[PDB]
Write a protein that binds this ligand. Structure first.
Ligand SMILES: *[C@@H]1O[C@H](CO)[C@@H](O[C@@H]2O[C@H](CO)[C@@H](O[C@@H]3O[C@H](CO[C@H]4O[C@H](CO)[C@@H](O)[C@H](O)[C@@H]4O)[C@@H](O)[C@H](O[C@H]4O[C@H](CO)[C@@H](O)[C@H](O)[C@@H]4O)[C@@H]3O)[C@H](O)[C@H]2NC(C)=O)[C@H](O)[C@H]1NC(C)=O
Ligand SMILES: *[C@@H]1O[C@H](CO)[C@@H](O[C@@H]2O[C@H](CO)[C@@H](O[C@@H]3O[C@H](CO)[C@@H](O)[C@H](O)[C@@H]3O)[C@H](O)[C@H]2NC(C)=O)[C@H](O)[C@H]1NC(C)=O
Ligand SMILES: *[C@@H]1O[C@H](CO)[C@@H](O[C@@H]2O[C@H](CO)[C@@H](O[C@@H]3O[C@H](CO)[C@@H](O)[C@H](O)[C@@H]3O)[C@H](O)[C@H]2NC(C)=O)[C@H](O)[C@H]1NC(C)=O
Ligand SMILES: [Ca+2]
Ligand SMILES: [Ca+2]
Ligand SMILES: [Ca+2]
Lengths: 71, 141, 71
């Protein structure tokens, strides 16, 4: 356990309010919301919109949680 | 031939040997105390940042002082009476986990024990662990 | 210095950086933020085959091994 030292989670108990991904900012202090591969980051005034953007050979899941190949 | 030489530091601040001085038959040479180095001007001394200039002095962490240095230990470790060697304080003993192509193996730090964590894999080329969930991850290439 | 043969990775979540190595023709040890910002080159000289990389966390030193130069 010494080789993974204890630290506070910036995205603590709320996913940092991010829709999909909360990533630690460079320098460790902050956090940045991000979107998966086949999503478009339509950044709004006070939130990041992860708008789905998947090819005609892909299928979009019901909750827009991900999109998978059509086969 | 200086007629014949004598110490040139004796006169007040001639050559401005910052720390200490010594002479010879036809010249002087200043010197600096341990923990101080002379810079290019050959007259003045500066502090050594032993925590950057010589990291190996302290086993675990270093704090620079003007002159000497002090070694300290990260939380969870205690410094043994030698003044420099930190020792892990947890009563959990570390063991190595490494991959052969077909196997993830368990090996003690001193090499005393050696056992299989898992077998029959394709080609495990990388692994990592998570202490929060006590879970192990690997890439089967 | 470009991704040609990535190998070896270590996180440093205290300062939010990811260090990785590449043993391509122009071998290097890179650094990036955990959220994909602040790309930089940490080591680029006297390095041919950096297969191995880690951070000690207690002293905050980066360590690596070169397979060719054998150090
Ligand atoms: C190998 O080691 C692993 C890791 O230590 C063990 O996994 C843990 O097992 C314990 C049970 O012994 C789990 O404890 C239980 O956690 C529940 C909450 O977390 C779980 O459920 C949420 C649901 O969203 C998941 O997100 C999460 O990942 C967990 O799966 C509690 O609700 C449980 O409480 C119930 O039982 C306790 C007593 O045990 C009562 O006091 C409560 O009233 C209640 O009835 C329970 O505490 C623990 O969560 C597991 N860890 C993980 C990461 O899942 C394996 O069990 C172990 N395997 C063996 C065979 O040794
Ligand atoms: C983002 O990446 C850059 C580039 O790698 C980082 O910049 C570097 O930061 C270190 C630490 O501050 C600098 O070292 C220090 O430099 C000063 C002189 O400027 C010196 O007095 C100190 O003793 C120390 O050596 C380093 O020079 C600097 N490099 C550059 C080109 O700016 C930066 O820290 C990163 N920021 C984050 C938050 O990720
Ligand atoms: C090189 O030159 C330096 C600079 O003078 C010398 O440092 C001085 O050394 C003397 C003798 O050890 C120190 O004197 C002692 O001071 C204490 C008080 O701290 C006193 O109680 C003792 O009775 C004694 O007088 C002096 O403090 C020290 N100067 C400083 C500022 O550190 C050094 O000794 C010289 N080295 C050589 C090998 O020539
Ligand atoms: Ca010092
Ligand atoms: Ca090369
Ligand atoms: Ca070799």
């Amino acid at each position: 356990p010494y080789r993974q030292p204890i630290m506070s989670n910036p995205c603590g108990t709320n996913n940092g309010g991010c829709s999909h991904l909360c990533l630690i900012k460079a320098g460790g202090r902050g956090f940045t919301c991000a979107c998966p591969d086949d999503f478009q980051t339509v950044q709004l005034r006070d939130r990041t919109l992860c708008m789905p953007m998947c090819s005609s050979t892909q299928f979009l899941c019901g909750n827009n949680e991900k999109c998978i190949p059509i086969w | 031939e200086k007629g014949c030489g004598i110490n040139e530091c004796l006169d007040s601040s001639i050559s401005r040997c910052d720390h200490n001085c010594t002479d010879t038959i036809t010249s002087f040479y200043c010197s600096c105390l341990p923990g101080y180095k002379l810079m290019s001007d050959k007259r003045s001394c500066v502090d050594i940042d032993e925590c950057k200039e010589s990291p190996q002095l302290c086993s675990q962490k270093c704090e620079n002082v003007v002159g000497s240095y002090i070694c300290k230990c990260a939380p969870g470790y205690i410094r043994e009476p030698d003044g420099k060697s930190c020792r892990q304080n947890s009563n959990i003993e570390p063991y190595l986990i490494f991959s052969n192509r077909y196997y993830i193996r368990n090996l003690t730090t001193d090499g005393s024990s050696y056992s299989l964590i898992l077998q029959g894999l394709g080609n495990v080329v990388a692994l990592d662990f998570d202490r929060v969930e006590k879970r192990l991850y690997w890439i089967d290439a | 210095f470009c991704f040609e043969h990535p190998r070896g990775i270590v996180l440093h979540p205290q300062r939010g950086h990811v260090y990785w190595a590449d043993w391509g023709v122009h071998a290097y040890i890179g650094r990036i933020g955990m959220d994909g910002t602040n790309k930089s080159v940490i080591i680029s000289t006297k390095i041919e085959w950096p297969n191995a990389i880690t951070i000690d966390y207690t002293n905050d030193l980066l360590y690596w091994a070169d397979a060719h130069l054998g150090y």
